[PDB]
Amino acid sequence: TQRTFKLDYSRDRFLKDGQPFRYISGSIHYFRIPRFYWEDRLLKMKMAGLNAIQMYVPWNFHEPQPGQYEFSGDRDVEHFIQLAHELGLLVILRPGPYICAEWDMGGLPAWLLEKQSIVLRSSDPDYLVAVDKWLAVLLPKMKPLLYQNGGPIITVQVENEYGSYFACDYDYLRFLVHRFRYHLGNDVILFTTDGASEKMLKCGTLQDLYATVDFGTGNNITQAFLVQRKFEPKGPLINSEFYTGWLDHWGKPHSTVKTKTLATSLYNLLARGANVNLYMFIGGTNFAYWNGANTPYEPQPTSYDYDAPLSEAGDLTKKYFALREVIQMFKEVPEGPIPPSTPKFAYGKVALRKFKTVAEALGILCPNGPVKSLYPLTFTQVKQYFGYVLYRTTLPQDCSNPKPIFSSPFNGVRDRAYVSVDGVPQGILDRNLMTALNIQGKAGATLDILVENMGRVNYGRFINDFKGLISNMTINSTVLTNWTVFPLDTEAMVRNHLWDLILPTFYVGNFSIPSGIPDLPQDTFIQFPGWSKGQVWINGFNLGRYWPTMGPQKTLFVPRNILTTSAPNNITVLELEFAPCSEGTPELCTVEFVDTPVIS
Amino acid sequence: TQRTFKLDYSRDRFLKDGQPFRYISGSIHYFRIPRFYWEDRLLKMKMAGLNAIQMYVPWNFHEPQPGQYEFSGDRDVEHFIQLAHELGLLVILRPGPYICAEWDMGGLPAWLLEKQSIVLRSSDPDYLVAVDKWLAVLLPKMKPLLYQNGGPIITVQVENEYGSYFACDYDYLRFLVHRFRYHLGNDVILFTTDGASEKMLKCGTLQDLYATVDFGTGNNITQAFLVQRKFEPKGPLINSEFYTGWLDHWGKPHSTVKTKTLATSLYNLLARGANVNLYMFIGGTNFAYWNGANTPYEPQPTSYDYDAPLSEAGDLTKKYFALREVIQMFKEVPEGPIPPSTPKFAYGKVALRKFKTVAEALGILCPNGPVKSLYPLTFTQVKQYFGYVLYRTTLPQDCSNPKPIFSSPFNGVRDRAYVSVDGVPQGILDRNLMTALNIQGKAGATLDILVENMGRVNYGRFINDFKGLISNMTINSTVLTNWTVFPLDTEAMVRNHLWDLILPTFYVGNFSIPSGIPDLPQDTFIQFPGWSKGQVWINGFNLGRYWPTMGPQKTLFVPRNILTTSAPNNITVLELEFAPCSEGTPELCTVEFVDTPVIS
């Protein structure tokens, strides 16, 4: 009755308790979906016929500050794994430390950047030390959840498309592998995932560690598995991320891949007897600052719908039933009715009201106190890992005639700055789009620049993503010293509430939900007609970034967990560009709750 | 600030705190809908723009046995009124004692029939005494809820189409009115409702009591209110039951009235400035034995959908929005989004299994013990106010050749009997349909007859509705003595579970519902493909009668309140005619849970 799971090289498969085995898995990120709904998605996953999941452990989700760890409630990954086990699902764990995943900085904590020249995903001694410490914290929590110790964990990913990274460090991989073996034991099954081309496996694979690839419908399947077999002559064929859809970018049209094309490809993969994981099965949500970025800079939106088999709000889609039908070819699917798409409710129009700009509330926003520096400091340099940062200086010259805010020594404003002087908004600045802007003000006037972190790049080489001013800020090639920066405690500020482009300002509105209705509150979608861009919280929960005027995302997912009946619902919007709220028309100064999402 | 509500004869209206007032009400029966959902319907009623409700107090719902009263939880009418008041809705109370309402025996308790020749709705001293006692119990509970005492009760109905009853007793009405004035005070506003023809008001109205009529879309509105004015020259015009739809009968096709026809008529009524109540606004449910009957006998089904503006399960229908739109012509409608149609879930097919016939379980069904009588006793005579009754005797003659079960002295088998001998089902008997049946058995064989109460007549003269055998049971005009009757405690029996027509037998099946799903359990509809007729309980809650083979009702409403997650769901079906469960096909021996009702 002992649980003996191990790769069967002879018969190119897995063996579970002596029986041939191959897994049909789907990715689910417990962190892009609220814990309130975890069971739901996982049960749907079981009802789809998957027998395993493939999930990432984002290091930054559990250690926002060095040595500070969060693992309870919404932070309780171990409970998530235990719940999956209770549902009869196996688990493929992917603990990184880099996960990509269109997630902030690939999971790595921003405070790593406190060493300016430090190198991530390399043999950098400080990087390796921090990685080791994180592993020494995380992995003992996973140890009792390993299959051979009676839990659902059957295989473990060590990296993610490591062949795409510039370093090509095999000492780094060896160091990771030694530490994983040390903390987790020799029994664990360790694997890699890389792009389906031998060039990437060249720098990704490693001895004493199984090698796998990923690929979607636009790859020769034969060629892909031939590429894998060139690195793993014996053992199961595995596609760890067979893409069912694709990520989005703001402005870029929403990617859509036909359902039945994915279905046909999936059938083809299954017919070879391989192991496939559907990335993503549910996409979930890009919370406040969890989004990543590519290069050339292009942040991912709030919605992570992904065109996944389960929609952002968990709806059963035609894709879901198609994939269930395909999977039922190769395994009996669980009996019983499938949990439904959640109910949606249109709460309708809710009004807001100008509360205060960031500048006029920094003390409430930053009650510990501000930061002073000779030259500007970056987001990391000011010890604010997310959010927005206020840069303040004095004008050294009279600017009665519009003077040009222009280049800095090496084009290092990232990623967006809203510029103003003594509460007079001057316009916008951004990377690759707008770096020059005429401004006006008297000599000695207070210049305030609000810098937004639009997301740390999550893929490629450009992980040294400073965020804000690093270099000597210059106006018309004229230097600027004596800077005061302001980190903003937006989360506690929203949770407490002190208890013609419009300057970044807060608009607070309320709405009530009746008590005693069994099927209220329900999940919903928030729309911002007439707004431009900002951040939104409900009852202190940061739902993420909105940008309807840029699109393609319009609605934001609102999980019903955050609404409280009888007690007033208190929405706070931080608008960065424009609000319909100056004139005498109040109806325009409203957001809306809708039932059917509109994201593309 | 004193609350002064009274009829304004001068200006043909009501006055509320000195202001002209007319009400736009809808009927809601707190008892045909589970308390779990009361708020829901009432809030929808508020969102429809109604400012009052018109509801019945069924005497039999609160006093099933003489001197035994139930008023807590699901029995807490006073809490229902208080909840309505809390929602800002006024209340029109209609406490009967007869309510018609397609409800059992017009609300009157069946034990009144323990006096065989007693007369209901007359000056019968025992009837008047029982009525008085009921009023003396009920009305002091309503007193603090009266408008002038700070509650939502503004007017009170004393009868219901009294002009349709044969007695034409004005002493009876005077007695009621005196008792109502005595217990409730002179301040109360008292009114009547009758069919819209002077002939009925002739016997319905009464001095010192306001007179109103009811009528639907097939009545001359001018003529109807002229008829009212002939009895009330001054005061508001009132239609207390403007029918938006109609009741159903088993077998009779489901009545449907076009939405917009009702809308046009409603607008016409409103334009006269009258007071109108929409009967029904929600219909709700016909539980276990709460249905009524007409003459010639025709029981109402389980569904009381009524084609009401709110569907049986509370869905917003095109009729609802149409009526809201009409009402918004004459009054501002409440602000905010309207509570939605409830979510529905298809739990799918659930199997059952033959447990035991009634005969083989009477001890468990009747643990106090059976009844013995020289000649058969009626349902009332055996002190079982609902349910089914077992009649047992011995065959006095050899019946090797089929002998005719035939007439009794005055055709008094009501309403349906399933006949068998020692567990050999012989067929069916019913009133006006089948009273003759050939049977076979040896002399001295035990003859068991299972008699179903299909519903006590709720309208007309025929309230002396015995239910079962009253007269000397005869086979081929041959008398039968030495009877043993068996009252069945079906409710406690289901709640405990001891912890080719098929004989009436119990089939128990289970189904499980996953835990941790925020939007599960949901309301549902149960279907019985292949079954014929019987009673169904879930977790001991008697959902009512099913009869798909007769129709028009197929599905049964299942409110989500009765489902319990993790704990097994235990459905019990008492089938009276036929089950698909003898052969080796188990799939046929299943009921189904569906999401969309199919009732017509």
Ligand SMILES: *[C@@H]1O[C@H](CO)[C@@H](O[C@@H]2O[C@H](CO)[C@@H](O)[C@H](O)[C@H]2NC(C)=O)[C@H](O)[C@H]1NC(C)=O
């Ligand atoms: C910002 O300007 C200061 C001006 O002093 C720079 O500081 C000097 O930079 C030169 C190179 O440009 C070095 O050789 C000196 O050693 C620096 N001196 C000090 C005291 O730091 C600074 O490097 C500039 N930084 C940026 C990012 O432009």
Ligand SMILES: *[C@@H]1O[C@H](CO)[C@@H](O[C@@H]2O[C@H](CO)[C@@H](O)[C@H](O)[C@H]2NC(C)=O)[C@H](O)[C@H]1NC(C)=O
């Ligand atoms: C949303 O705003 C309402 C309005 O103040 C809050 O309701 C009060 O919250 C305070 C907490 O600071 C309590 O002390 C009061 O008792 C609450 N009012 C009542 C009538 O009880 C509500 O708490 C706010 N919600 C959130 C999530 O902050």
Ligand SMILES: *[C@@H]1O[C@H](CO)[C@@H](O[C@@H]2O[C@H](CO)[C@@H](O)[C@H](O)[C@H]2NC(C)=O)[C@H](O)[C@H]1NC(C)=O
């Ligand atoms: C059932 O049969 C019995 C037979 O005795 C009837 O009892 C007699 O009925 C006659 C009228 O038919 C009366 O005059 C007698 O006074 C009754 N005698 C007794 C002792 O009751 C009885 O009435 C019959 N009942 C029915 C409903 O048919």
Ligand SMILES: *[C@@H]1O[C@H](CO)[C@@H](O[C@@H]2O[C@H](CO)[C@@H](O)[C@H](O)[C@H]2NC(C)=O)[C@H](O)[C@H]1NC(C)=O
């Ligand atoms: C439905 O049937 C199940 C199966 O027995 C019941 O579950 C048990 O109920 C008994 C009560 O007699 C408890 O003592 C047991 O502890 C229950 N089982 C477990 C595992 O806890 C369930 O109670 C039944 N439901 C209803 C409403 O009768």
Ligand SMILES: *[C@@H]1O[C@H](CO)[C@@H](O)[C@H](O)[C@H]1NC(C)=O
């Ligand atoms: C893939 O490539 C192999 C050889 O390179 C070829 O035989 C096969 O037909 C190709 N299939 C597809 C779908 O491109």
Ligand SMILES: *[C@@H]1O[C@H](CO)[C@@H](O)[C@H](O)[C@H]1NC(C)=O
């Ligand atoms: C910017 O600086 C240059 C110095 O060469 C000066 O000539 C120019 O006038 C400045 N710009 C403005 C708008 O004054």
Ligand SMILES: *[C@@H]1O[C@H](CO)[C@@H](O)[C@H](O)[C@H]1NC(C)=O
């Ligand atoms: C900047 O700060 C230094 C610190 O002493 C001060 O000497 C200098 O005058 C300041 N310059 C301006 C422009 O405020």
Ligand SMILES: *[C@@H]1O[C@H](CO)[C@@H](O)[C@H](O)[C@H]1NC(C)=O
């Ligand atoms: C919500 O805020 C508005 C702002 O005027 C206020 O009128 C309203 O009463 C508030 N809602 C509740 C339930 O108090």
Ligand SMILES: *[C@@H]1O[C@H](CO)[C@@H](O)[C@H](O)[C@H]1NC(C)=O
């Ligand atoms: C109703 O009857 C009155 C007089 O009896 C008549 O004037 C009116 O036109 C009738 N209206 C309808 C709708 O029958």
Ligand SMILES: *[C@@H]1O[C@H](CO)[C@@H](O)[C@H](O)[C@H]1NC(C)=O
């Ligand atoms: C019924 O009773 C009559 C008595 O007149 C008898 O003649 C007849 O045979 C009986 N019926 C049967 C089926 O025996």
Ligand SMILES: *[C@@H]1O[C@H](CO)[C@@H](O)[C@H](O)[C@H]1NC(C)=O
């Ligand atoms: C009916 O009961 C009486 C009561 O004593 C008994 O005398 C009689 O024999 C019984 N008759 C039958 C047919 O059982």
Ligand SMILES: *[C@@H]1O[C@H](CO)[C@@H](O)[C@H](O)[C@H]1NC(C)=O
């Ligand atoms: C429900 O009853 C069936 C009858 O065989 C049984 O197999 C099943 O285990 C029961 N369900 C649960 C959850 O125990």
